[PDB]
Amino acid sequence: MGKRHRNLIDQITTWENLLDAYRKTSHGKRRTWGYLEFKEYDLANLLALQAELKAGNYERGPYRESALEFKDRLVQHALCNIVAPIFEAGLLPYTYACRPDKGTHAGVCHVQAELRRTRATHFLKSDFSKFFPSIDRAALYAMIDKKIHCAATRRLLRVVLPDEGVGIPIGSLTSQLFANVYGGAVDRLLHDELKQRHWARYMDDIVVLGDDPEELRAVFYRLRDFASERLGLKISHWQVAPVSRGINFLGYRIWPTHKLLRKSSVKRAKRKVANFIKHGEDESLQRFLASWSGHAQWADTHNLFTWMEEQYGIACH
């Protein structure tokens, strides 16, 4: 209702929403123990869930490690059907992560496009050290809270994601959203403060085309000082090169002209994982996974981590 939004738990628990949440949570999880044990009495289950949420007695079943039980991924989907579009609407257009009709491509296309027009002569690329494991979960809930205003959605948000820690249990539906919202704070220190207008952020990676490589370096210093003091995230890699390095954005190397993609330790990792599975070595795979989850937490391996969790069930996070 303009800021406000002070009655979301009424719409989160509308039956017709939990059925959408149900159909969304079951998309392709239709061969998981979770769906198949829930599917049995699905609509009697959604009637004990609706009425657990409609009361304020929902309590998240444990994060299996960070996957969730079907009941929970449905609660997360039922949140992130009412709560996501009141956050993903404040997300500045140039945020290209986990929002419909933006994404991998519309970002790389925006960048290439904004590279052709404006004829950028430089660019700042940055990246957040260990982003999800460093999101404040506290100054997050000062953004999940200048927007939710409903004292029951807020308590469901705080069950699905406690207000006490520094680790967004990475890779939920509630966590993709709240990480975009979170990294939307640096978008509103680029676009609002700092007034830079040729950028793209995809979750933790942030391209900032300039013309003055010295301005980009300023922008970066201002971005780091902000994100260190206000969000609590450091910058893993950065550079101020011309568009001759080709912005290494989102798997591509994006010149104004061409747009070479890139190679894939992915393949090494996929093969490593697949081997580990069909070697009975699914316990050193957790060590490897934890390792590659560090080499790829700078990267944007959410989809890939979901994908590898779906091939089997081994929780990457």
Binding site: E40, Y41, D42, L43, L46, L47
Partner: protein, 111 residues
């Protein structure tokens, strides 16, 4: 108790579902006759179960309840004309779930 309890709770399933299962059109006639044989013939499955004190008979009572839940799913699908509206599936699933609870307690009591 037990067998008496199960079936007075299952009579509510029948009392809800038999009207639904008599509304299924003749077109969906084989499904209906088989659904009615699953619904009204589950009483015999319970009856046999509480006449043996053997858990395999109470597991085939669970199989019958599971098949009945299949029939709900299925009859909510049958796009042809139709039959069970999703609300009826929801309500019946609640009823069958109550029978499920009692069957579970009974399975446990035997265990």
């Amino acid at each position: 108790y037990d067998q008496m309890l199960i079936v007075e709770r299952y009579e509510r399933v029948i009392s809800y579902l038999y009207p639904i299962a008599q509304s299924i059109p003749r077109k969906h006639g084989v499904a209906r006759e088989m659904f009615l044989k699953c619904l009204l013939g589950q009483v015999e499955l319970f009856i046999v179960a509480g006449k043996s004190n053997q858990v395999s008979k109470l597991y085939a009572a669970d199989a019958g309840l599971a098949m009945l839940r299949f029939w709900l799913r299925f009859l909510a699908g049958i796009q042809k004309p139709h039959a069970m509206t999703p609300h009826q599936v929801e309500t019946a699933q609640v009823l069958i779930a109550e029978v499920g609870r009692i069957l579970g307690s009974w399975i446990a009591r035997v265990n």
